[model samples]
Target: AVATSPSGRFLKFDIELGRGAFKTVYKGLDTETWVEVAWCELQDRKLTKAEQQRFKEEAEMLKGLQHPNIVRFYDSWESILKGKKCIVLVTELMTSGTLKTYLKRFKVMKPKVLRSWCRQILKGLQFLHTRTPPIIHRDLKCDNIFITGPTGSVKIGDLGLATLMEFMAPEMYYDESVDVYAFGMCMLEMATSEYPYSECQNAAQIYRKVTSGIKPASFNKVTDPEVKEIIEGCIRQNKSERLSIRDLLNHAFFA
Candidate 1:
């Protein structure tokens, strides 16, 4: 079956592009320009009116964002499908997949290449953090970094959508440093091709290690001293000790 946006300017097909717990992304087309787009639909279970309102306003803000390293948000609307409430978002489609997917192709990445990726991600973070009120990307991971192969372009994605929770201790408010820590994990994964705390067999154990200011076992796998230094600085147990995104961009690794 086919679906059309409320404005009827975008059309979504049955072609599934990606899927997550509560989201289904389909290949869609913008009727105005006939350009391909990612039509993401997320099921909302009994969402309060305030939550829905905030979601719309956030989408509006995201659309105003324009950066080479950030994904482009096109349009969004609330709709009901199959008699259930859902939110539809139209965004630039990146057929090249995410950094996590790209990593699987190469067991090891060159330091230069890794630096390039890290710089791109940092630039993206810089753009978000430098905004009027600083946009804190609560969920920054390899999975959210999309890449375009031909142009070697990387874009930070999944913006304006609230991630349930990850990292950070209980009741700790989110700040730019939160994303720095997450970027540290991304760097560790890119260098070693291993997820942080991969040694841990369960979430509880991971939580224990994270809350106790423990570095992931993957830290030992990173052999490059310069690389390790940056990662370590980003994930310091004390949030204030963590390097800001701007400071990280000026790091010697990028020089």
Candidate 2:
């Protein structure tokens, strides 16, 4: 028998889209509407009761989010698969995959194209930061955002998984400015097709450079004056001085 949601509205097949350490995403179907979906199953090892409660709260929050630039989360539930507790989430599937993979194929990107992508990403950030409780995307990076080739539309995904040190801001209490800092790194990647701190030999090295107010070497490769200035403003060592999403949305780079 095929795997189906408890509600019987969705069913998953043998096809695999992708997988991380504990999460497997399968090609799925919306039985009632014939729409396609990415059936994501995250296997949970026994976590603390508090951790479990937090997971549920976050899932419920994720379910309520609706925005054009954000990945559409339709439903999620708890289930047991292979004698292991798992969290299953149904989301709109982007066949083109993440922007990280997309960058691998195309090494050169024009500033105009990057600007359009930047606008869409900032719009998504605005929606998240403006929420009543204000949701900060703990893991915001090009690797976590999906892009549709046909429509040239970008949607932010993987809101809560984690962050790569390269995209992370300096050590401190996490806040909206953290995301802005990551966005600056994302912009740098979009322009140069290189990961920030890629030259760093290890996480400790990256940490030293990041905390000591050293910018990624990729920053030097950003030739556009406007692009460089905006990125500098976002990745400022002082969190207080980092530009907000609103400021980015109105930036002259987009004009």
Candidate 3:
């Protein structure tokens, strides 16, 4: 993966990995550590001061956190992309890609195994939620979940891109439960190997079904009783009653 960036920094990017409204990611390697890493590029120049702080905020959020379930944040520096000063961040590369892609290719994992995965996710969320000032993931979904290809270990990623957390809706959550809702949707995707509300023609229609209290067809389709119960708890219409990250770890399903 040893490739040179536009600024001539020896990085690991050989191809475009993913793109968002604000940034693009490439597969790369860290020559110093000789470890796999994602080469993240954040667009600059046109960004407002507020928008630019998102990258700064992301760095601050990750710097203090330490957890195996959370993605590792390495280093960031200013660099050039197409003649503009872009923010470049280097992070541990997840070779298994996203949970969405993994599930699509590999099918639903055994309930016991998937339950373990869910526990790891909740553990990561708990660390962020209980931190002083309480960081809200603001978004949680399979696409935001990454795994190590060899170990099948899970990690939460893409902390800075708001528009990229597309499973998100216009609904307002004044607290961390917004993440719980998104996590529930991710579970639905895992159990069925389908996107939530995939039958809906568009976002508006999908939003309508969710707001109307109609659960995704796939959610109802899960035959695993324990899995169904856990997801239901995560996505309750009453955000207050939804399982908090701490309580979720104590859930019976994981036992």
Candidate 4:
């Protein structure tokens, strides 16, 4: 199938496609170069002023980032589709899907595999956290991580929710502890294969559950005491008590 472009170009569609709450994605073929293209169309009408600014900021941020564990953006453009202005981002396609999908196929992964995944994730986080103006992935989740099948390589995705520390004023920038909090939730997802806060009926319930010192039993099964401690430390109710991403990366969990 081919979608007619505004310039009268025919963008050939590939087999894979997916949908999200606010967007629809289609795998396409670059008619000229034969390169694979992953296209995302924003479902909203023309972006609000704030949304347009955010999209530009995120695009600039992604353009400056260079990491093996970060997805690379090829091109971006805007188009009018069905009377709506759609933002389209072209990115490298991951063949193995997301970490969440991979987990469904394996009941229990070997420690080596888990360690590899964890290490790659930490490396990616380290790169972001160590920046002069750190970048915090506010929405870190299993679905936001993609893996390569044969190599088991992991790359962090979904930068729409990412926040650059320097861009925000001192009062607006989130403290480093917020990243630690999100990291803890990511760890929980890996161990339990359950969505963080999914069990709670609302934000208040989730907050209460988190503040009540409840630890997921799945983490308790971790034989490595150091690993358990690091994960627990990140999830501390008091943000000030959360471990720094730098410290967490250097901990015995990775050693």
Q: State the C-alpha lDDT per candidate.
A: 0.83, 0.82, 0.74, 0.66
lDDT of 4 by residue, 1-255 (tens): 656444333363745488776677787655556776677666445444456766676676776787888766555556765677766666667778887887777745566776778778878888877766777776666787889783569988876534321111112226666667666766666666555556556666655655575654566565656666777887776666677777777777675
lDDT per residue as tens, model 2, 1-255: 279988898999999888787788899998988989889887766432456667667767878899888987777777887789867888888888777887787777766778888899999999999987888986788877998773488999976443211447885627999899988989988977888888999889988988898998999989888889998998899988888998888887764
Tell me each candidate's TM-score: 0.93, 0.93, 0.84, 0.80
Order of candidate numbers by TM-score, starting with the best? 1, 2, 3, 4
lDDT of 1 at 159: 88
Best by TM-score: 1
Residue-level lDDT of model 1, residues 1-255, one tens digit each, is: 388987888899999978898788999998999889999988766474666676666777888899999999889887887688877889988888888988887767777788998999999999998987678888888888999883497999988565321455322538888888889889999999877888888788988888778888899889999999999998888877888887888887885
Q: Candidate 2, 67: how far from true, in Å?
A: 1.4
Best-fitting candidate, scored by lDDT: 1
Tens-digit lDDT string for candidate 3 (42-90):
7765554565566576676676777898887776656676888767776
Clashes of 2: 0
- Candidate 4 regions exceeding 4 Å error are 1-16, 30-34, 161-175, 193-204, 211-213, 217-223
- Model 4 weakest lDDT span, ten residues long: 164-173
